[model samples]
Target: MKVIFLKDVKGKGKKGEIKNVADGYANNFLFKQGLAIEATPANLKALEAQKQKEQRQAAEELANAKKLKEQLEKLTVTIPAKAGEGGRLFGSITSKQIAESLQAQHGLKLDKRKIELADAIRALGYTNVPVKLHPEVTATLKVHVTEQK
Candidate 1:
């Protein structure tokens, strides 16, 4: 009997898989347990529709990520810190601070963990910071660390 699995069977078939099994097993265990459905024409059509929906959602996610990437590339995030006489920073800047400043300045709610700061900024100048908005997308933001008067 040919069937499409609705749930995974350990050491056997996984969900979304179509396979053939013994007639007795299909009638007694698989049909009785509701683990799968007979691969009728209607059921296969339903599976194809479900797969298409998943593809559309994934494309939408990638498009959003790419859009955000372009926006961040053109943005400059400014952060303020107290400095001494020699134009040295009194305290280093952290990813947490950057994340907050971006939100406060541009109204973008990005997480601190997404900002890839190689090290804390202990200098007063402009630097490029890499931000990971998605697994396949890495955007760069120009960060300006200014002395707070």
Candidate 2:
């Protein structure tokens, strides 16, 4: 039986996808759970529309991410940390801290995963951090670590 998946089904297919499944599985599991519906002509048309809408939304999100990347490139973040006489920080700075700082400073909600930090910042100095806004778009964040005076 042919059905349109409304949500992602593990080992089967993703949302907004048309899949072929056994008649019993389609009628019993997929249809019963409201995860999918039989592919009628009208439903197929609606599925196409839904796919187009999702594509448009994804494009808009990518554009916004690129805009955010550009903004982040222009702004430098100064992280104030407790340091010893040798300038080694008491505690290290991580991506979570940077994401939180972005939220606090720019009112931009960024996921910690987007802030790519290979390791915790230990030494006090200027460093470059990569911000992965999209698969193809990334921004270098200028991070200046300063000791509290």
Candidate 3:
């Protein structure tokens, strides 16, 4: 049986892709789960149109993310965390905290999931971090960490 995937399915296929599977699997699993539909002529045409639409949307989103990156480059977020000696924070600072701080400080909201942190920062200092604005857009952020008052 041939089926068109509605979205990316792990160990299966991606959106707009046609996959061949057993009729029983297609009817019982893929079709029932709504992950795919029969790959008829009409469905294939619709899938092509959907793919084009998605491509356009992705391009537009990437452009918007680039514009946002320009504004973000000008932003220097300062965080004051509870610290002891040597300007080290009492606890680690995660990407979630940085995203929230960016929203609070600049009124520009960022997704925490977009921020990639190798590990939480335990020391207070200036660091450059990468902010994933979009799948195609990534920008560096300058963060200044200091002791809380």
Candidate 4:
């Protein structure tokens, strides 16, 4: 018997997967537990339509992310910090501060977690910061750190 899994079944199949199982098990266990439905022609067609819809949505989101990436690459963010002798920063600049500055300066709202910083900025200079807007979209923003005084 072929069954379309409505949800993941341990050691069996995952949701939206079609698998062949014993007729007795399909009728007695899976059907009674409502873990899956029979893989009828109409059910298969509906599943295909749902999968196509999901693909279209994913592509639309990817396009939006790419546009944001291009916009971000053209932007420069400025952050003010207190500096001591030799222009060394008193404290490092964090991603949260960067996010806040980006919003305040450019009117762009971004999540701190999406800003990929290998390390905090500890120097008073201009640096290129990498931002990950999506899995396939990446961009660099020029960040300028200046003395607060």
Candidate 1 error regions (>4 Å)? 7-15, 26-37, 85-87
Residue 135 of model 3 has an lDDT of 72
Q: Rate the local accuracy (lDDT) of all candidates.
A: 0.85, 0.84, 0.84, 0.87
TM-score (C-alpha) between model 4 and the true structure: 0.85
Model 4 agreement with the true structure over 41-80: per-residue lDDT tens digits: 9987887787788789999999999989988988889998
> What are the models' TM-scores?
0.78, 0.76, 0.68, 0.85
lDDT of 2 at 134: 91
Give the C-alpha lDDT of model 2: 0.84
Candidate 1 has an lDDT of 0.85
lDDT of 1 by residue, 7-29 (tens): 75664443358878677788788
| Order by TM-score, highest first | 4, 1, 2, 3
Error of 2 at 62 (Å): 1.0
- For model 3, residues 1-149, the per-residue Cα lDDT tens digits are 88898655665455577888689888898788888889899999988987799899988998899999999899988878898878777898889888988999999888888877778888888878898888778998888788887
Pairs of residues at least 3 apart in sequence or in different chains that clash in candidate 4: none
